[PDB]
Design a protein around this nucleic acid. Structure first.
Ligand SMILES: [Mg+2]
Ligand SMILES: [Mg+2]
Ligand SMILES: [Mg+2]
Ligand SMILES: [Mg+2]
Ligand SMILES: [Mg+2]
Ligand SMILES: [Mg+2]
Ligand SMILES: [Mg+2]
Ligand SMILES: [Mg+2]
Ligand SMILES: [Mg+2]
Ligand SMILES: [Mg+2]
Ligand SMILES: [Mg+2]
Ligand SMILES: [Mg+2]
Ligand SMILES: [Mg+2]
Lengths: 54, 177, 136, 104
RNA sequence: CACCCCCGUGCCCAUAGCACUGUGGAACCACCCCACCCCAUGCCGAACUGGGUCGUGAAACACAGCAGCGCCAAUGAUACUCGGACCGCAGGGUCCCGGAAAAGUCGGUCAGCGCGGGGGUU
RNA sequence: UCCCAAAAUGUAACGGAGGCGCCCAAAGGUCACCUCAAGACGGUUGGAAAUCGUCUGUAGAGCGCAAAGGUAGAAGGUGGCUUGACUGCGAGACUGACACGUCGAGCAGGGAGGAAACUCGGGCUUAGUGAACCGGUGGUACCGUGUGGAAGGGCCAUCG
RNA sequence: UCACAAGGCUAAAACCUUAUGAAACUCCGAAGGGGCACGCGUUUAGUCCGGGAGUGAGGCU
């Protein structure tokens, strides 16, 4: 969207699977503070949980 | 405990007094309800801690923090924040704390001569809240900080106020005449 | 006269008078005959006329009331740029509607106070006298 | 307070489900577990517990689960839906369950 | 259902609701009693839950009475109005033809139709 | 979003009012549980309003924001577990001049909650948006100019 | 919901009788309209594929 973006930021959720695959959504930094930890499907295998890469 | 038996000896007392066609159709006692509505001006975490302590030490039952109904009038009010403290006593511990009260409470009350006999819950029940805390069996000024007071509400399953009244008194209760 | 708080602007349309064609609160009554608009000041005028003629005190029921905002654009403006800003207030008196009720005065007094009010009015009128018990 | 029952009741999609729903009633120390074809205003099987009970008051749940499911064998009922009540699926009505849930 | 009654559960979603009122008890329901555990309380067996009585049917429920309230609601006429034609400078209004309300008056109503089970008819 | 808008949709004006360019890691998925505003009587600080109790109580409340519709058998308030705020698709419609846009059963992989029937491909819904072009980044090994490599492009993703 | 006429009543609000306005009020609610099936009954248009357009200032009641 736009640059200034203090609350909510487009973060990319990259896999642990080392496949290559990632996701994108938004986190508030008011409430995530540290990191983001989520469990979604991987289409290069089946279902292997990612972490909030920059 | 014993108080239960005394209720069961008030039961033919009120059966005989009122001529009830049934023994369950007689005034009984549902819960005791202890409120502690400090807050509004007392926004101190320390203070609601103290009220928790005091309540837990007299009533022998954990107390609930009844928050602000989120009504925020001109003066000091707000959304979801501690403003009152409730402890609902019924059954056993009701009878235990209530006997603690007739026994050691209103007697040890500074300048005591009974309470208001003019009608309460005209539906047929009766409340009565009580002030000071320096008039107690368990509360001490040698185990607190400042000085407070509370609220008390019984539910007589009566049908009018004369019948409530009767139950109350013959259960052992001071009516200031 | 005016309403006290509202929404602001309005519109215009017509057919015959809803309620009420009947004579409550009084013994004699004055009735519209024409689909007018009626401004505060026009009533104010009728009120002051009749109030004077009755002296102290009689009894005066001003049934009609101006809730309708009428606007007028500023002086010398080309159309558009907006809607005109609330010039004055009208009360949409439809025919047959009873505008006035007076009582505590003779028939004569009523006739006169009426006629005097009538000459101050944008529209023809007629006076009448009770029997209209549709309800009470 | 009637909210729990009419809640789960509508939450059991009556007809469009296909399956048959199965009532209970363990409030008193007598129950009624009915089996209903919802749509048609008719009640199929059923297996009460007030025409002799052995003696058990809540221990007998498994019994009438097994008894009901027994009626279900004969009438030919293999599919089901569990219409509980204000009853929070725990002990007694869980017994009636597990019982019918094997003894079909 | 054989006749009643009670328990569940439905179609119906107030002419089916509420109040006042009477009836009801071991035969279903209810309160009841106990709770260290299953289970559960933003606190408390109040509620969910669990072991079970007697006692009471007073509360609640079921049933009956009732038209105070609520709800349902005519005919008659009217409002408006398709479509035929008209008057008024205009605000607005009329005639013919069919359709036709709302509110109100008459009233109507303390519902009706099922399924299953239990328990009774010396 | 409402009114205009003439009881189908649609419909203009420098006509009449008001919001948006977000927010939420729980405000989502599921599972389970709870019922509101307000007034009247009586209640230690209070005493217009606080917190407790009884009675009334179909919505006179609440829904992150505008309003409209909607909603008490929940969308409203609370808790447990959670990552369906998922890939590969899309029967069939709504809607637009086109491009767009919207709803969506059902199949596969593979998971979440539930005892289970089941529900979940974001949020009660309707705003929270930017077509191409040129470029950044992670994967991919489709083309690669004698051949084999590599520069470079292409594809899916994605940021400006 | 907002606005409003006389009175009651009360400490003013709520509430009671009487009484009324509303594009952005609605317990209700027509005439008419719109979709679909038939054609129970008359009549002539339609739809699709392809060639050629012009029009996109409208005017009055
Ligand atoms: Mg005409
Ligand atoms: Mg006619
Ligand atoms: Mg007719
Ligand atoms: Mg009855
Ligand atoms: Mg139209
Ligand atoms: Mg146009
Ligand atoms: Mg270019
Ligand atoms: Mg690349
Ligand atoms: Mg490359
Ligand atoms: Mg009516
Ligand atoms: Mg042009
Ligand atoms: Mg043009
Ligand atoms: Mg034109």
């Amino acid at each position: 969207a736009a640059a200034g973006a203090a609350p909510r930021i487009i973060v990319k959720m990259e896999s642990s699977a080392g496949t290559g695959f990632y996701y994108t959504t938004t986190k508030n930094r008011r409430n995530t503070q540290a990191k983001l930890e989520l469990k979604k499907y991987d289409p290069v295998a089946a279902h292997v949980v990612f972490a909030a890469a920059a | 405990q014993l108080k239960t038996k005394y209720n069961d000896q008030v039961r033919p007392a009120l059966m005989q007094q009122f001529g009830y066609s049934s023994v369950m159709a007689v005034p009984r006692i549902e819960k005791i309800v202890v409120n502690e509505g400090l807050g509004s001006s007392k926004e101190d975490s320390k203070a609601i801690d103290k009220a928790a302590k005091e309540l837990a030490l007299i009533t022998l039952q954990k107390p609930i923090i009844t928050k602000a109904k989120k009504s925020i009038s001109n003066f000091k009010l707000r959304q979801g924040m501690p403003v009152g403290i409730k402890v609902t006593l019924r059954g056993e511990r009701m009878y235990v704390f209530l006997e603690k009260l007739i026994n050691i409470g209103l007697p040890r009350i500074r300048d005591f001569r009974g309470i208001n006999p003019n009608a309460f819950d005209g539906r047929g029940n009766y409340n009565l809240g009580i002030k000071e805390q320096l008039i107690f069996p368990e509360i001490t000024y040698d185990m607190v900080d400042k000085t407070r007071g509370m609220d008390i509400t019984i539910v007589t399953t009566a049908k009018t106020d004369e019948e409530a009244r009767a139950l109350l008194q013959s259960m052992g209760l001071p009516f200031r005449k | 006269k005016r309403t006290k708080f509202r929404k602001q602007f309005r519109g215009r349309m017509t057919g015959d008078a809803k309620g009420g064609d009947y004579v409550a609160f009084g013994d004699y009554g004055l009735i519209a005959m024409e689909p007018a608009w009626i401004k505060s000041n026009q009533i104010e005028a009728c009120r002051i006329v009749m109030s004077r003629h009755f002296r102290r005190g009689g009894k005066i029921y001003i049934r009609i009331f101006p809730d309708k905002p009428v606007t007028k654009k500023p002086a010398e403006t080309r159309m558009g740029k907006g809607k005109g800003a609330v010039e004055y207030w009208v009360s949409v008196v439809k025919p047959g509607r009873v505008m006035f009720e007076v009582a505590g005065v003779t028939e004569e007094q009523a006739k006169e106070a009426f006629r005097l009010a009538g000459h101050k009015l944008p529209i023809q009128t007629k006076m009448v006298k009770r029997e209209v018990y549709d309800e009470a | 307070r009637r909210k729990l029952r009419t809640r789960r009741k509508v939450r059991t999609t009556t007809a469009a489900s296909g399956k048959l729903r199965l009532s209970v009633y363990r409030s008193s120390k007598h129950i009624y577990a009915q089996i209903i074809d919802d749509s048609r205003g008719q009640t199929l099987a059923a297996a009460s517990s007030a025409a002799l009970k052995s003696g058990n008051k809540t221990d007998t749940a498994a019994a009438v689960g097994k008894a009901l499911a027994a009626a279900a064998a004969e009438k030919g009922i293999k599919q089901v839906v569990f219409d509980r009540g204000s009853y929070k699926y725990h002990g007694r009505v869980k017994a009636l369950a597990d019982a019918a849930r094997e003894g079909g």
